[PDB]
Design a protein around this ligand. Structure first.
Ligand SMILES: [Ca+2]
Ligand code: NA
Length: 101
């Protein structure tokens, strides 16, 4: 499957209970494979849980994956970078991240 959807594959791996949402605990466990600091992952979680419900839907989780890629590229998150990933078609250019599984 050379064109396999890696965002979807990560969503399915992260969603341990199959309820179609990524819970806080599921995100903590999944992103332990990201190589990022807990401070950065906290900021990504906050930015991604747009409804403040404690769960990420698919869109929210894919956006958290995009922010993880930017952080793995050693770019400092700025308000402009965050908005570019969350609210503009620049998001489509961001690869899925590398996650140790
Ligand atoms: Ca879940
Ligand atoms: Na939410």
């Amino acid at each position: 499957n050379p064109n396999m959807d890696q965002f979807e594959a990560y969503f399915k791996r992260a969603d341990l209970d199959g309820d179609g949402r990524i819970s806080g605990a599921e995100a903590v466990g999944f992103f332990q494979g990201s190589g990022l600091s807990k401070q950065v992952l906290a900021q990504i979680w906050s930015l991604s849980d747009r409804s403040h419900s404690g769960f990420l839907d698919r869109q929210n989780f894919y956006n958290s994956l995009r922010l993880v890629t930017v952080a793995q590229s050693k770019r400092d998150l700025t308000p402009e970078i965050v908005n570019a990933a969350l609210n503009t078609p620049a998001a489509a250019k961001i690869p899925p991240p590398k996650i140790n599984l």
